[PDB]
Design a binder for these strands. Structure first.
Lengths: 813, 97
DNA sequence: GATGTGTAGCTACACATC
DNA sequence: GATGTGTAGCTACACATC
């Protein structure tokens, strides 16, 4: 027998059995090195390299996940690796293996790669996949290579990164990740611009994660793929451990935790909650205080969310928290926050044991609370101190708002602390807000709470007038009184006639505040004015008109606040404030809603105009279709597609309105027909026109919009099923209205778009008999008196057929 | 009050959590073997055929995306943010009544 | 476009071992 | 405690096929 043929039989034997199982992979590796060693001693080195390649070519056309391929691939990888390993431990100390095995490997690996690179651009998707698959696994164990082959690998890969199939694109990055120490650039481009989420993921996990690439990696925390948003917290932030607090900037850091704790998916939240509680706490040795220094508390907003999840994860450490007795000399923003967090936690879940001894008495807290007020406001990094003190004061105050005040000495003690705190003329707004909140909790009744507040307001007012004794407080003072009044009025919930002091206050500055020339003072005047209008109806009517002028001619800030007032006046009083003797006509106000909604220059004002109108239509205080029609148009319109806040508002409000009550859905059906028409014209106008900036794709395609309107009008989606709502004809009448409109459109494609999706209808035997007949008479009319598109013809013929069969069903007594 | 309003409040939030973008994002054996001994090797060249007509590449339209496939800013429009008044968050109106 | 089957990640719990 | 292994179930996203 020939030597060459013998070599072929030996290697072929190995591959033939290795394909069957992983059982003898170790032996096979040893056999191959033996076959190789015997071939190189006889001079037939090239004969081994030749055959070996031919057999790895037999497995390439196999699909992905084909069980046979994997086994051979693993073997080939283990063979290369085992050879490399023999070569490393030698170089560590022992040298030089006199049988030229370093050259044999360099000569073998170089020759092997160039063989599998003949199927890198094959038409077959499976060949391209497994070629890239072989390279990724053997990449680490190549060792040294000639320069030319290095250029041929990056050349082939930088093209395969943009390959048609996602699978081969994944294997591409795996092969590029081993080159990172130009390769980085390409992976940063693929993690952002690749459509397949699994390529973004692959580029995310295996990226270098140095200082320059870290931002793109943490970017995926808001990746549209759920999995890619979960692993960034799980895999990447566990791999960094404490490197987050050291290498990641706080402003980016505070954002990450924010996204994770309130993500819409249950899976992503647990990945972030567990990360903070389990991993970071254990990584920080259980120091709950040091953990709060990481999660900055003075400048963050979700620490409340993080501390809850922690208490849920570790209820055992919960009991060991000690607020050591009367050592509050050193009270850090972490501790002060800790206090608020723990106290409000026990109240929410009724941790009865703690509320007894683990917390100071009402009067004993007033000692510490006041202790920081003098230290801040009375007597003289200074601003750091100022902020921290206000922060501490804030935390204790929020907890003080909800304390047990069966004790009377404690209540009266604290009361004297807030009253001398609220009277301060340099109290920052965050403390003003909570101060009123606490004083509201102390008062025995409403009138009490009002009186005390009013007194503090007038005192600060009068203290400046009598100092000048031109009888009007300084513009500043006017601000302080008004902000204090709003927070009070937000808590008052009874008519004005029963509290005479409100009217007196309102007569003094709430009114001159409206007539002021300063924006901020004006805005505040309207704010307080609105809060009073919710209490006295006649006061609202007398002020309906004045508000309408500020929403028309007022600057953005004033126009912003003024509109909100009008929405709430309606929420509580309904239509009693319009259309009547001395009452403004609703038509004028509908015209003001139009202007705000239409206005493209001020987005936020659109949002409240949209959000408000939905609330009103929900409560059935508004029922004008021509307005409700304009409301839905602003959702799909291409001019409002750029306002992110505006889209989501309608996404939530329109479904709830249609599904809340039959009448609300009916209203959609009656007008939704004309809606689709106006949008069809808008899409056509948008598509055909050529104007340097277009983004004709900035709007939905009429086929999608059609499905949308069919969804909302679908009577199956009514939340309250009376059992007899399945005979509702709302969607039929809608479609009938569209068919009468079908003749006004002129473009084939659009007409196809409408027709193709008409079979999402819901037809039932209990539905009326004459309405289906009508719909059938319009459907067949269009089908057999117009030239159709084979696609549109079959789908339409189908709809016709659905009826016909249906008419027999109902036609039978 | 609010037996009916809390009832429906609970329903919509849980049901409409993936529709928050609300913009076109609204869902609603053989153990075959290879005989490495046989010499059907002229198929080897079938593996290395040139692409020819088959595109096996991505259109340049998809090779770059400006959205970067990131979520849009979440305003967390929930049934709570709608029930509460604007200037008086404490109080709320009785829509769904 | 619309399909059915696939598959990637989990998630969860019972454990058995160290 | 800490850890495996074992099965089972699940959801979004792939592919396959027509």
């Amino acid at each position: 027998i020939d030597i060459n043929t013998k070599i072929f039989n030996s290697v072929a034997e190995v591959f033939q059995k290795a394909q069957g199982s992983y059982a003898g992979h170790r032996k096979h590796i040893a056999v191959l090195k033996k076959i190789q060693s015997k071939a190189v001693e006889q001079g037939y080195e090239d004969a081994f390299n030749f055959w070996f390649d031919k057999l790895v070519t037999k497995i390439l056309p196999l699909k992905k996940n084909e069980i046979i391929g994997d086994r051979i691939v693993k073997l080939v990888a283990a063979f290369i690796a085992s050879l490399e390993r023999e070569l490393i431990l030698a170089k560590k100390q022992n040298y030089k293996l006199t049988n030229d095995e370093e050259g044999i490997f360099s000569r073998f690996v170089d020759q092997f790669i160039r063989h599998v690179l003949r199927g890198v651009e094959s038409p077959d998707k499976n060949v391209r996949f497994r070629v890239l698959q072989l390279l990724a696994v053997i990449m680490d164990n190549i060792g040294e290579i000639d320069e030319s082959l290095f250029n041929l690998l990056i050349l082939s890969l930088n093209k395969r990164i943009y390959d048609r199939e996602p699978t081969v694109r994944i294997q591409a990055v795996f092969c590029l990740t081993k080159f990172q120490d130009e390769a980085t650039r390409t992976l940063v481009a693929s993690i952002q611009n690749d459509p397949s989420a699994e390529v973004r993921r692959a580029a995310m996990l295996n990226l270098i994660n140095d200082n320059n690439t870290r931002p793109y990696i943490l970017e995926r925390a808001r990746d549209v793929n759920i999995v890619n948003r979960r692993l960034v917290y799980s895999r990447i932030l566990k791999s960094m451990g404490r490197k987050c607090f050291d290498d990641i900037e706080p402003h980016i850091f505070d954002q990450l935790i924010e996204w994770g704790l309130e993500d819409r998916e249950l899976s992503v939240r647990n990945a972030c909650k567990r990360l903070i509680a389990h991993d970071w706490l254990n990584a920080l040795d259980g120091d709950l205080i040091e953990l709060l220094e990481k999660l900055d508390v003075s400048r963050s907003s979700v620490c409340v969310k993080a501390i809850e999840a922690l208490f849920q994860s570790r209820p055992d450490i919960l009991s060991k928290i000690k607020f050591p007795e009367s050592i509050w000399k050193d009270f850090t923003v972490e501790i002060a926050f800790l206090f608020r967090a723990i106290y409000l936690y026990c109240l929410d879940n009724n941790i009865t044991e703690m509320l007894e001894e683990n917390f100071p008495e009402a009067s004993k807290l007033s000692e510490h609370l006041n202790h920081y007020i003098l230290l801040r406001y009375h007597h003289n990094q200074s601003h750091f101190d100022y902020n921290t003190l206000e922060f501490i004061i804030e935390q204790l105050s929020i907890a003080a708002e909800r304390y047990d005040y069966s004790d009377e000495v404690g209540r009266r003690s604290m009361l004297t602390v807030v009253r001398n705190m609220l009277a301060l003329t340099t109290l920052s707004e965050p403390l003003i807000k909570i101060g009123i909140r606490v004083m509201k909790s102390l008062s025995i009744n409403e009138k009490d709470f009002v009186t005390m507040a009013i007194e503090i307001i007038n005192d600060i007012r009068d203290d400046d007038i009598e100092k000048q004794e031109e009888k009007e407080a300084s513009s500043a003072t006017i601000v302080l009184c008004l902000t204090r009044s709003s927070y009070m009025l937000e808590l008052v919930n009874t008519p004005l006639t029963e509290n005479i002091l409100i009217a007196s206050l309102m007569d003094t500055l709430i009114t001159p505040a409206v007539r002021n020339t300063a924006p901020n003072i004006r805005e505040l005047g309207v704010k307080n004015l609105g809060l009073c209008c919710l209490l006295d109806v006649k006061l609202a009517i007398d002020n309906m008109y004045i508000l309408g002028m500020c929403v028309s001619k007022g600057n953005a800030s004033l126009k912003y606040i003024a509109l909100q007032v009008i929405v709430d006046i309606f929420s509580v009083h309904g239509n009693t404030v319009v259309d009547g003797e001395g009452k403004v006509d609703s038509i004028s106000l509908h015209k003001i809603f139009y202007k705000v909604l239409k206005n493209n220059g001020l987005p936020e004002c659109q949002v409240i105009a949209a959000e408000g109108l939905c609330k009103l239509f929900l409560a059935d205080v508004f029922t004008d279709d021509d307005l409700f029609e304009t409301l839905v148009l602003s959702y799909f319109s291409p001019i409002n597609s750029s306002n992110e806040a505006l889209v989501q508002a309608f996404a939530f409000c329109i479904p709830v309105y249609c599904f809340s009550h039959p009448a609300h859905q009916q209203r959609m059906s009656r007008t939704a027909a004309d809606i689709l028409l106006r949008l069809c014209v808008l899409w056509d106008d948008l598509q055909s026109s050529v104007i340097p900036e277009v983004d004709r794709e900035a709007m939905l395609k009429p086929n999608i919009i059609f499905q949308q309107l069919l969804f909302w009008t679908d009577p199956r989606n009514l939340v309250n099923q009376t059992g007899s709502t399945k005979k509702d004809t709302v969607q039929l009448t809608f479609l009938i209205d569209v068919l009468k409109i079908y003749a006004q459109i002129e473009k084939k494609e659009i007409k196809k778009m409408i027709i193709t999706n008409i079979n999402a209808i819901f037809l039932s035997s209990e539905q009326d008999y004459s309405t289906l007949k009508e719909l059938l008479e319009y459907s067949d009319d269009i089908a057999e008196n117009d030239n159709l598109d084979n696609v549109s013809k079959n789908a339409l013929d189908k709809l016709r057929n659905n009826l016909n069969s249906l008419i027999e069903e109902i036609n039978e007594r | 009050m609010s037996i009916f309003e809390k009832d429906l409040m609970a329903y919509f939030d849980e049901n409409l959590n993936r529709n928050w973008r609300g913009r076109e994002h609204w869902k609603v054996k053989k153990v075959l073997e290879i005989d490495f001994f046989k010499t059907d090797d002229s198929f080897e060249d079938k593996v290395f055929a040139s692409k020819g007509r088959t595109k096996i590449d991505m259109p340049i339209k998809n090779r770059k995306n400006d959205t970067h496939y990131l979520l849009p800013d979440d305003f967390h429009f929930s049934t709570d943010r709608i029930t509460r008044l604007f200037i008086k968050p404490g109080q709320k109106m009785s829509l769904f009544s």
